[PDB]
């Protein structure tokens, strides 16, 4: 380009070529799980009377 | 039910995250003090905020 644009492109480039900063990203995924089943049940079977 | 909560700046977003980070940490430390009682199992705990 014209020397006028060369000097303009030269500032654009210098701004655009800036050392891009780096990012360290730690994620922390914590899960906790449990639970309590209970099955208690009583059956009575009698020949004479009846069964449950 | 939906309960929104707005973070205008960063300092409100630490406190909001710190109380979930700690309430989660405090829950793990509570689970250790039952597993410690029962013996022969391990629940492993998240450190303190900002210590890695």
């Amino acid at each position: 380009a014209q020397p006028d644009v060369m000097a303009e492109l030269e500032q654009v480039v210098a701004k655009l070529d800036i050392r891009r900063a780096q990012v360290l990203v730690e994620a922390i995924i914590v899960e906790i799980a449990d639970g309590d089943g209970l099955n208690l049940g009583v059956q009575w079977a009698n020949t004479n009377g009846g069964g449950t | 039910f939906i309960r929104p909560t707005i973070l205008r700046d960063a300092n409100v977003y630490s406190g909001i995250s710190s109380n979930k980070y700690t309430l989660f940490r405090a829950q793990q430390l509570d689970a250790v003090a039952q597993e410690g009682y029962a013996t022969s199992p391990d629940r492993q705990v998240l450190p303190e905020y900002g210590q890695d």
Side-chain angles (χ1 to χ4, degrees):
Chain A
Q2 295 73 1
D4 173 21
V5 180
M6 202 46 99
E8 194 174 348
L9 286 171
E10 170 193 352
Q11 288 180 331
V12 173
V13 161
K15 284 175 200 153
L16 201 46
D17 185 72
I18 57 147
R19 149 161 211 193
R20 295 205 290 293
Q22 294 172 339
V23 179
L24 169 63
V25 177
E26 295 98 350
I28 298 98
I29 298 96
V30 286
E31 183 282 334
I32 291 179
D34 61 342
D36 64 339
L38 169 152
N39 45 25
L40 74 83
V42 179
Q43 341 187 0
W44 305 347
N46 185 336
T47 64
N48 263 32
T52 316
Chain B
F1 306 98
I2 191 145
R3 174 176 71 248
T5 295
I6 278 156
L7 306 164
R8 294 315 290 285
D9 55 0
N11 277 336
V12 174
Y13 176 68
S14 62
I16 299 309
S17 65
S18 66
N19 287 338
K20 287 182 136 266
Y21 198 79
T22 60
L23 177 59
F24 183 80
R25 161 182 234 281
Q27 284 174 345
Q28 281 188 333
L29 292 174
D30 290 346
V32 172
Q34 284 174 324
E35 292 307 320
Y37 181 75
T39 308
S40 294
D42 194 11
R43 282 164 146 157
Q44 71 281 2
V45 73
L46 200 73
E48 197 124 274
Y49 190 82
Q51 302 298 304
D52 175 23

